[PDB]
Subunit: 108 residues, 4 copies
């Protein structure tokens, strides 16, 4: 609910949430962080397309894609292939972390 | 509740939780991942001391310390100084990620 | 979280949250349910005072109080004395339930 | 999550969770509240059947049913037809509340 894992996408209208904080891939292709109803950060890509999705990729890049498979905005954080996370944190920061350094190996 | 940030500690009896998954720093100094009442992973340090704390450090090492400030168990993942997270994931894996590659910079 | 128990208050600026839904006791004494940035319900008491708190009472009434201990808005649901909950639900309804009909009695 | 709404069921192996607290409809038809790995309350119906479901009914009764549609255990809280909730609370109590006294009417 507040974590996007590498290999997952937010569809249009979908969000990560922590308390009053919402990080949403809007239908107007703007990527916005709201504190209640106040925009605090945006990709500033509102109106460049419709029906965009947000991908957290295996190369560590967070990308807004238009439905033509066309890059609209990116974090520009391509690097090592592996596992990454994008988190809406309790401190209201949105952060990409990776690669994975250690695991219990208890996945299902 | 399912994330430990670098610079934070779990005190004795404290846990990270996702649904039926509990990752707990026990009073007997064992670090255990439970699926409901079933231990699925442990540090196997039960009885080596009392009143241990778990630290997620800035160097990326997850360490169980005894109250004498003495290292009892570690992930052995020291590297670059920065920001890391330890997550109890929805897939029941416990994972350390870092360093931070990008942020909105919207922290309070 | 998404539950206010009878005997608790939301202070000014505090909220109940479920995913993109935020139920906030605003600084301007308006009680508002937001879906992301869109107000979908309000007490319509914005500007009648400053520094109001929301109280879920053991008589089952949800009341906005001004700092003079003065009733500004209420659900008008006074009844049996007991335990009640106010919930921001997954279906985006905000509901008062009570009284308590049964419990395990496993409270701390 | 930590709420079961009237009209919903927990299937075998499914749980309500708050932090280290797990309320599970087990495969062995026992209904158990665990604090980490410690059972603190049970229906004591382990082994009376297999593949039971827990149902929070609109008559306010919480019932364990066997797959033959047969009552195995109940809270015995039948009353007014309406909307009820069963909650695993932050205080580690499991409580049934209802009926609904008030709502915003903002459901989807
Ligand atoms: O090695 C760690 C990785 O293991 C995978 O199976 C998943 O659980 C990933 O989320 C995780 O990053
Ligand atoms: O640069 C990213 C870092 O910024 C800090 O202020 C915190 O929000 C950290 O959790 C985060 O890793
Ligand atoms: O008996 C039910 C009541 O028990 C109390 O001690 C608390 O746990 C209340 O939240 C609950 O409604
Ligand atoms: O009127 C109250 C009821 O409204 C219904 O439509 C649902 O949202 C129920 O969960 C709720 O109890």
């Amino acid at each position: 609910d507040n974590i996007l894992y590498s290999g997952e996408t937010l569809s249009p209208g979908e969000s990560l949430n922590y308390g009053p904080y919402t990080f949403i891939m809007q239908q107007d292709c703007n990527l916005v962080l709201y504190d209640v109803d106040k925009p605090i950060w945006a990709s500033n890509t509102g109106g460049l397309a419709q029906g965009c999705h947000l991908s957290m990729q295996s190369d560590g890049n967070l990308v807004v894609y238009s439905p033509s498979g066309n890059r609209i905005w990116a974090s520009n954080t391509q690097g090592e292939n592996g596992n990454y996370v994008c988190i809406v944190q309790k401190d209201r920061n949105v952060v990409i972390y990776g690669t994975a350094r250690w695991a219990t190996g208890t996945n299902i």
